Amino acid sequence: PITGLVYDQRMMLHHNMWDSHHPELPQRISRIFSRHEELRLLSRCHRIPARLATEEELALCHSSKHISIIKSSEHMKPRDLNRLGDEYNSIFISNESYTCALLAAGSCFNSAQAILTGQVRNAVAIVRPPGHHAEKDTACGFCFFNTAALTARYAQSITRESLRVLIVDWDVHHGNGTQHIFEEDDSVLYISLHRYEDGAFFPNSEDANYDKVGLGKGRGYNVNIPWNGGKMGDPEYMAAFHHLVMPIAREFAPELVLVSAGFDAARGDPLGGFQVTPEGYAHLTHQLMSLAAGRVLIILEGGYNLTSISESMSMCTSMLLGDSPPSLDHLTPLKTSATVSINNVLRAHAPFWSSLR
Numbered sequence: 001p002i003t004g005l006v007y008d009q010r011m012m013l014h015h016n017m018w019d020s021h022h023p024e025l026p027q028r029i030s031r032i033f034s035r036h037e038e039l040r041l042l043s044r045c046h047r048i049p050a051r052l053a054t055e056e057e058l059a060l061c062h063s064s065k066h067i068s069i070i071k072s073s074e075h076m077k078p079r080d081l082n083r084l085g086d087e088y089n090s091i092f093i094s095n096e097s098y099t100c101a102l103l104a105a106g107s108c109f110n111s112a113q114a115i116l117t118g119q120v121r122n123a124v125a126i127v128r129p130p131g132h133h134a135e136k137d138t139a140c141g142f143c144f145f146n147t148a149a150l151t152a153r154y155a156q157s158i159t160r161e162s163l164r165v166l167i168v169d170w171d172v173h174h175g176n177g178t179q180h181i182f183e184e185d186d187s188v189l190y191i192s193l194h195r196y197e198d199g200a201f202f203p204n205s206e207d208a209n210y211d212k213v214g215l216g217k218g219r220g221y222n223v224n225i226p227w228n229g230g231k232m233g234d235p236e237y238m239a240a241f242h243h244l245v246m247p248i249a250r251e252f253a254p255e256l257v258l259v260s261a262g263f264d265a266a267r268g269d270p271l272g273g274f275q276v277t278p279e280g281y282a283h284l285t286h287q288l289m290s291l292a293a294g295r296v297l298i299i300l301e302g303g304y305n306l307t308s309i310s311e312s313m314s315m316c317t318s319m320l321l322g323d324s325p326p327s328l329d330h331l332t333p334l335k336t337s338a339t340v341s342i343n344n345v346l347r348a349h350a351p352f353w354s355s356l357r
Ligand SMILES: O=C(NO)c1cc(F)c(Cn2nnc(-c3ncccn3)n2)c(F)c1
Pocket: 022, 023, 089, 090, 091, 130, 133, 140, 141, 142, 171, 173, 202, 262, 264, 271, 301, 302, 303
């Protein structure tokens, strides 16, 4: 009956030496932690220590080349760091980055171990830099290694290869890397809600559309929920959870739930354009607690409004600690285009999931 929490200030060391106001700020994690202390949620949690991932553990999802190129960034002078960052889509690198990326992955491993040993029921990980855009062979969108994908493999490596892991990615951006790593896999169901705008919204690829349902034995186990036609909030996320996420998760019956918890769909986020409220995030969290006998790990991805990500993640920890879900005052019907999105996903996944028929 215990919630784990991992936070280590050394993860603030990764910074953008060229643009000190880049939105992926060191103080993202320090501001979330401070807010957990102000709401007296910290002292109610079990503190799980951070550790570095090993290179063997990074090879769970990533190639030797990729691991080696990022490792090499530790010793690089700024000129070479700049040159390295520019070989990927929207990466900045510092001396401390590789170590911050290892610490974000090892923290989630220790969290996943605490859950699967029974030391805790569920856990939150306040880590940076984020992960879901990192693929097997490259870095992308502020992500070096895919934290959530590596945690899924780590779980299976201390239990059994077929341990059923559900990854729910409610970060506003599509987890291009998560999807690719597990696209052929029936043991790991990936479900992403994301702004799409027919490929105008980052990371700008048709891989994030609803018709990408997975390949081979993993056909059905890749569920994309792409939003089009501007602003979305609590009503559209509640609806997608009611008709898609929760019916598909129940018929999959995960033994562990991982949340790629970006808070960039928050009211206030300058990159997302959405209005998902802190209470919206609490409801999403509370529904997922109904799965896998409550074995949920919430992993920080994006979210760039310091007040919004502080309020929203603290609100998710409150649900994990077993607090009553807040009143939404849900009084809104769905945007026309969010209904069109949900029926598109229901038509494409009904061949695979009996509960959408
Ligand atoms: O992980 C992400 N969200 O959670 C994420 C990753 C991304 F690469 C992008 C795209 N982008 N590249 N550069 C920038 C940028 N740079 C400086 C000032 C403003 N904007 N935005 C994103 F919009 C979001």
